[PDB]
Every structure is written in C-alpha cells, then in structure tokens.
Design a protein around this ligand. Structure first.
Ligand SMILES: O=C(CCCC[C@@H]1SC[C@@H]2NC(=O)N[C@@H]21)Nc1cccc(S)c1
Ligand SMILES: O=C(CCCC[C@@H]1SC[C@@H]2NC(=O)N[C@@H]21)Nc1cccc(S)c1
Ligand SMILES: O=C(CCCC[C@@H]1SC[C@@H]2NC(=O)N[C@@H]21)Nc1cccc(S)c1
Ligand SMILES: O=C(CCCC[C@@H]1SC[C@@H]2NC(=O)N[C@@H]21)Nc1cccc(S)c1
Lengths: 125, 125, 125, 125
C-alpha cells in the first residue's frame, strides 16, 4: 500500500470551486476525473498522474502530478493542464500545486501557448 | 483513432539526452516510460498523461501533458515532474514542453519546492 | 500621475513574512527594497521594476513586475528573483504575483537553475 | 566594476527576433529598452532590472532579471513581462531566460492572467 494511498484517494476542491476526484494506486498511479469551475470546460474530464508511494518520513509532503486534456463528450478546448505539487496530510490536509496549461497553437503563436498558475486543494470547501 | 495517435506513439529524445517512450491511446491516453539523462534518476520510470485526440485542423499543434514520479525499483527522488506542451507533426516533428518539478518538502521549505524548465523532444537526437 | 502610483507606493508584506517597500513613479518606474523572511538572504536588497501607469478602467488589476538580485553588503546568493503580477486596489488591496528565482549554475546544472512560486502581498500582515 | 558589466552591456536578440538593449551598472543595475518581434507591442519599451555584479568564479553563469511594462507612447497592452535567467560569457555568450507575462484582469479571470515561456538571447541573430 502506498503510504498516502488512503490520504490522497477521494474528492478535493480548489480555491476556484473546481472538483478533483482521484484514486491512488499502491504503486504510484493516479486516476480520476476533474471538473473545472472556470474556463472552456463542462462536466468531468479524465485525469491520470503519478505520486511518490514511499515519501520521506521526516515530515516532508508527498510529491505528485497529474494531467487533464480538456476534451470530453461535451467540449474540446484544445488544451491540457498539468498540476505538479505535494500532498500534506493531517487535520489541514492539502494538496498544494502549481500548474501549466498549454493550448495547441500555430508556430507563430507558440510563444503565448502556456499559462501558469497555482491551485490549493482541500477536503472541504 | 486519435488524429496524432500514430505521430505521438514512439520514442522521443530531448536536448539533455533523456528518452521518453510513449503509447497514445485512441481516446486521449498516454502511457510509457521516461529515462532522464540528468538529476537523481536511474533507468526507466513510469509515466502517464493525456493528449487532445481531436486537435484543431488549422495547423495548430496538439496539446498534451504527462507526469513522472521519480520512484522506481532503483531510486526515489521524492519528486514528480509534469510536462505540459504541444506536439507538432511534419518532417521536423517535435514535442515542445514546459515542465514543473516538485519535491516533497517540509512546510518551511515549501517556497523552494518547485523547479520550472523547458524540454524540446525530437524523433532523432 | 500614474493611476495607482499612490496605491502601490508603500510597504507590503507577503505570506512568508517578507517585506517589500516600493516607490512607484508617475511614468511606470518601481524602485525600492526587499527583505526576505526565507532563504539565503539577510537585510534589504535593491529592487527595480515597472508597472502600467494607465491601467484599464474596467475593474482589471494593474500589471507590474520587479527584480531583486540577491547581492547586498551582507550576502551574495548568486541568484535573482523576478515577480510578475497585478495590483488590485480597494479595502482588500493586494499584489498577487508569480515569481521565478534563477541561480547562476554550470551548464551541466542549468536544467535545475530556476524555481517558480507565488507570493501574495498585503498592506497589513 | 561588475564582473560581467562589460559582457552584459549591449544589444541582444532572442529566438523570436526581439531586441534587448541594456546597460549594466557597476553595482548591479540594469537599464535599457526592449522591442518585441511579437504580441501587442510596437517600438521600444523601458526596462529595468538587476544582476549579480560579483558571480561565482567556478564557471557558473551570472544571475539576472528584468521587467518591461508594455506601455509606451504608442501602445498599452496592460501587461508586464519579467525575465529571470543567467548570462553565460565566452565565444557563445548567451542570456538564457524564463519569463512570466501577467496581464491586468478582473478577479474572475485572474486564474488566466499569466503566461510562461523561455527566451534565449544572443549577440548575433
Ligand atoms: O479553458 C480551458 C479549459 C479549462 C481550464 C481550467 C483551468 S486548469 C488550471 C486551473 N485550475 C482549475 O480548476 N481551473 C483552471 N483551456 C484554455 C484554452 C485556450 C486558452 C485558455 S486561456 C484556456
Ligand atoms: O532529480 C530528480 C529526478 C530527475 C529529474 C529530471 C528532470 S525532469 C525535467 C528535466 N527533463 C529531463 O529529461 N530531465 C530533467 N528530482 C529532484 C529532487 C529534489 C531536488 C531536485 S533539484 C531534483
Ligand atoms: O535563497 C536565495 C535568496 C532569497 C530568496 C527569497 C525567495 S524570493 C521568492 C520568495 N518570496 C520571498 O519573499 N522569499 C522567497 N537564493 C537561492 C539560491 C540558490 C538556491 C536556492 S533554493 C535559492
Ligand atoms: O502582447 C503583449 C506585449 C508583448 C509581449 C512580448 C512577449 S514578452 C515574452 C516574449 N519575449 C519576446 O521577445 N516577446 C514575447 N501582452 C499581452 C497582453 C494580454 C494577453 C497576451 S497573450 C499578451
């Protein structure tokens, strides 16, 4: 069993009101769905990612990351976001992340292809 | 079949000499392995991600992203990188990406948890 | 007079307990000092930057950015941070920012030269 | 005299065909102008920044950063870019950078306020 398999698995909410539902596998897998409260998005989108299933025991958080491609049965925003961050357990559990959102562009517009931001996920909104 | 399922699937090399081997599924899945030429890494690491299986037909690239957690049978660097970018087909096919590498840290060191960079992947090194 | 010359000029504090003291000039200049509560830093460091002295009047924030090179009379951390963000006026005035911290490295270590994060600045801590 | 005062001062060109003209002061100052080959920009824009005037002598590059607010006598793009990077001397001198471009936005659009990219500057294009 991954050290934080149980801690990570479940439903998380960010500061924008988005919903991230994930299952963490014993050997580092992350599968789930993401629903964005903002942007060119509707309903749930597949996500997959990875996490460190054997983190340091020194009080450090647990490194993880995942991707959503913004295509589902309702919409295609020709874009993909990746979240990179760490899970922190305890009464105030939180997944703190930075993210990159890249659109498909022409070569001429590629300089402006990628947004950066930060999302913090909590178990209760 | 994803528009670029065939274009994406295969072996890619970046400017550092890293090797990314990926299979793109018809409905947006990315699975594979990553071997880093640099950092606290040895041999192959699992990766998963997503791509836009129906990109714009206007000459735009194809949005995609993936994650590696830097734990395998040889090492655990308590970290995860996500690559966010776009695939561009044609004689000079390339996956252009920006990435975020987050380590597990204490809360005191969390301000310095995350590296950012950029990798460009080609079919021949 | 810059629209937010008065709003921006003064002392700001971030979530880490750092202190940013800045003067905004009528034609877009930012000068001041920065004192970091964290990292390889002691006392004040020079900063300079720029801001949009004629922002949109539609309720948008005011774009701005500044740099600190982490060399002063006490220390040299061979690094520089740039903050890019927007100032938002009103009872809850805030400067919201993302930042890049680049160290001087050898070419071999250049892939790991740059940290990314986010600071939010307030008028009262 | 800053170690790389002479090396940095002058005209640089990036991969997009932009022109950066800068003067480095003996005590870490950077002043100059920037002309973008892309985006909502015309002619030169003021820039200011900082650099490490006493870098490591171990072959490491020289940390530096600067800002442009995208307002001049011709246009106002209500935005500011900061470049964070390192200067590398020698026959192939280069300033390697990552950058953040923040627009002024409403609070509702703030999640999409900031672009990230990377520019490499050379002495000859
Ligand atoms: O809008 C989308 C799809 C939805 C993005 C949701 C973002 S993902 C990071 C953040 N965290 C959340 O929970 N929501 C937001 N793509 C797109 C394409 C072209 C230009 C632009 S600006 C945007
Ligand atoms: O070193 C690792 C594991 C290997 C990273 C490989 C990077 S991933 C982006 C880039 N692209 C490549 O192909 N290779 C590089 N983690 C780690 C932990 C704590 C502090 C630091 S500085 C680094
Ligand atoms: O430590 C420093 C100097 C102080 C940085 C202060 C940062 S600036 C962004 C953030 N916002 C604040 O208020 N404080 C923090 N440079 C350095 C060199 C080599 C490796 C590393 S990891 C770090
Ligand atoms: O277009 C501008 C002003 C010119 C940016 C030039 C960039 S700065 C980084 C890069 N390096 C260069 O040399 N050129 C490019 N701002 C703006 C406002 C709202 C939305 C968007 S997408 C863009």
């Amino acid at each position: 069993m991954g050290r934080d398999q149980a801690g990570i698995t479940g439903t998380w909410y960010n500061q924008l009101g988005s919903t991230f539902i994930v299952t963490a596998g014993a050997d580092g897998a992350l599968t789930g769905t993401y629903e964005s409260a903002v942007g060119n998005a509707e309903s749930r989108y597949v996500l997959t990612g990875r996490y460190d299933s054997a983190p340091a025991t020194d009080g450090s958080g647990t490194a993880l990351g995942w991707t959503v491609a913004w295509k589902n049965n309702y919409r295609n925003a020709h874009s993909a976001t990746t979240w990179s961050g760490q899970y922190v357990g305890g009464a105030e559990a939180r997944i703190n992340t930075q993210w990159l959102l890249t659109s498909g562009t022409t070569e001429a517009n590629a300089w402006k292809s990628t947004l950066v931001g930060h999302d913090t996920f909590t178990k209760v909104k």
